Design a protein around this ligand. Sequence first.
Ligand SMILES: CCc1nc(Cn2ccccc2=O)no1
Length: 185
Amino acid sequence: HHHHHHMVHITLDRNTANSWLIISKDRRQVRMGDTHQNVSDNKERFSNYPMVLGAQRFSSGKMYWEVDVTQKEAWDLGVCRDSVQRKGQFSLSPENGFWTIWLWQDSYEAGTSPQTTLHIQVPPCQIGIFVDYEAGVVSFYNITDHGSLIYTFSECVFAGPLRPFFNVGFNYSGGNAAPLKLCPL
Ligand SMILES: CCc1nc(Cn2ccccc2=O)no1
């Protein structure tokens, strides 16, 4: 791919974070805390899962960013509608306003309904996310494997402004504490 020149500087929005997340001072890293992080509740916060949104909203153009997933066992990444449900239980699907991939129990899957198996030969340490708003495309790239394509959502019906979407995943196992990090441009 040759999408690197649409690079955007993403920062995390504290106010959208699950109350157990710890976001770094620079707003570029997020990890699971071992307890509630002593913040007030609000209608924006994801309640059921360890999720947070980027601050940036996109309604046009081409955008690209990279995320470090080194040594994590579980995570979700992609984009979502600004209007997605925050409270209670829901599935990650385009019908619910999410265009995502994930790692879970040693398999990679795209968040279609039902989910799609991904064929990754080189487990990624960094993931590239490309959005073309006008084209209706969200693509995922394996930066560890020379930028190889992971998955393309096409014919997307965004139906609103998009936000970068993150899930650090639970840490029941003690093997998933590592952060998600937004990688430098
Ligand atoms: C949304 C609630 C929540 N709790 C935790 C953190 N947590 C707590 C116990 C066991 C595993 C584990 O990951 N993360 O989200």
